[PDB]
Amino acid sequence: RVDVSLPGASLFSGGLHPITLMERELVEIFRALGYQAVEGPEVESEFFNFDALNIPEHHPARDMWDTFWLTGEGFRLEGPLGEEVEGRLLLRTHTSPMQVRYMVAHTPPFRIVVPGRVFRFEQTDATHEAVFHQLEGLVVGEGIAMAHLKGAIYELAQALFGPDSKVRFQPVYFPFVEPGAQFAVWWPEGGKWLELGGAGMVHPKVFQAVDAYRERLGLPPAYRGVTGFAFGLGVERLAMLRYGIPDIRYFFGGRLKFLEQFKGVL
Amino acid sequence: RVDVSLPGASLFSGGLHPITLMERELVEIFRALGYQAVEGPEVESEFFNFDALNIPEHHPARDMWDTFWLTGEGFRLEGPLGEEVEGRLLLRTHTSPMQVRYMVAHTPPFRIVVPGRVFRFEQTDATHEAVFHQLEGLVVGEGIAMAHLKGAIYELAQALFGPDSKVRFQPVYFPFVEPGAQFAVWWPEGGKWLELGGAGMVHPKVFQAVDAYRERLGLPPAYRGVTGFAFGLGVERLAMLRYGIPDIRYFFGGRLKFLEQFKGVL
Ligand SMILES: Nc1ncnc2c1ncn2[C@@H]1O[C@H](COP(=O)(O)OC(=O)[C@@H](N)Cc2ccccc2)[C@@H](O)[C@H]1O
Ligand SMILES: Nc1ncnc2c1ncn2[C@@H]1O[C@H](COP(=O)(O)OC(=O)[C@@H](N)Cc2ccccc2)[C@@H](O)[C@H]1O
């Protein structure tokens, strides 16, 4: 006979990091809405991160992002069409620059979602990080309206918190969007409004920078008669509320006792 | 020193069956279009498989499906709302009965896709099976038109064969659809039209059987002012053309030398 209750061979059992899980669900939610996930580079030029997004230098608007500037020769930063690009290098302060990279390399209409690691120079506490993730959304084409942006967030909220969930839209400022807005979702289980991110209708000047970069590259203009909306939300906070993580610093902490607790979420 | 080129511990490497892969891609394609995957039971009653789908007994229409009838007491067949149901048991000849199960258990508008094992009494050759899989599609709601059904297949073809792909729609008959149709997709790589499946606008009588079953169950009618389209395509053939499998009998053959060749498709 054999003790069938004895532990078997200690084969290893793996797991996915909580941000991977939260990113995966966010991506699945938007995939169901027609969005496709594309990524951008963590090291960007000032042109894509700021200038092309209507965020010029020495202006109050740029203070909304504490940049991490870089130095070093020999580094080749590829642009939207593999062409080598130049400009003061930095660590992207948000995923937004992919809005520009994508649009020069493609034609409307389309729906994309860009997840990604972003960086910001600021002190890290229990609810703040200098290194975190964002999920960008961009939908462009004839007749795209803000009603559609609200429709997207409503679907996001429903998928994330259920039918007793709701979204809230309030005016807020971003150089890359003309109506500008900030949105929150009602979390029933916790009976409170959490601010998810910012969004708005793509600014006129963003489309212009996009087509100007296209012209300077031989491509024909593709965004003169289209509108669109974009949004950007910060993954960690959503993940924290969703997995009951109290300290945002745990994410990059590397502690196995922390990571292991998420194997169950397949 | 150590011979680092020596084979390592013989840990096992798994794989997914080719039908699982083909089903997964089909489901991913429709998920991107807003469809949700739901399954039905392999053992059905004549009511769902035929009667509710406007396919009465002793009529030419029913010959389109060679049924596998069943016998045996003690078996409990659950209906759309867990209620025990009766009726001559059989092995579903198609996924279509899920159209009815779903509609009694839900309210429009919605988009579903039901993959599933189906059975038919017929001789198995190199390109025919008595046991195979189908993928059903059902989209219901106000204003749903055939233009939308054509739109869906066009997207299916694009996703499956590229931009040089195209769809063809020809009149064909099915008791559960008033315009009725058969569709084919142009496969560039093979320069030929393959017949993928049948579809059409949900028949008036299907909606009626659905609401009648609802009434007989206490639920209010939910399909009097809506239209919709449905389609059903046979997975094996698509998989064969896509993975270059010459013999459809290989699928249920169980031969590892065959199955193993699909580990690469993750
Ligand atoms: N220090 C931090 N730690 C964790 N999350 C943070 C931190 N700073 C911000 N976030 C998250 O980042 C999200 C948005 O970042 P902001 O810098 O506030 O906005 C942006 O980064 C804009 N690019 C978003 C946007 C995109 C498209 C159109 C309009 C607006 C917030 O909702 C928040 O949850
Ligand atoms: N013996 C077989 N072996 C492998 N595939 C088969 C076999 N018989 C049919 N198929 C596949 O099954 C697909 C459709 O099956 P049919 O029995 O022809 O139709 C049907 O089964 C209908 N229920 C489809 C439908 C759904 C919704 C609306 C309209 C029509 C075909 O396109 C074909 O590729």
Curated annotation (Swiss-Prot), chains A, B:
Reaction catalysis annotation: tRNA(Phe) + L-phenylalanine + ATP = L-phenylalanyl-tRNA(Phe) + AMP + diphosphate + H(+)
Leader peptide range in chain numbering: none
GO BP terms: phenylalanyl-tRNA aminoacylation
GO terms of molecular function: ATP binding; magnesium ion binding; phenylalanine-tRNA ligase activity; tRNA binding
Subcellular localization, as worded in the UniProt entry: Cytoplasm
Family per record: Belongs to the class-II aminoacyl-tRNA synthetase family. Phe-tRNA synthetase alpha subunit type 1 subfamily.
Name used for this protein in its record: Phenylalanine--tRNA ligase alpha subunit
Portion of the parent chain present: 85 to 350 of 350
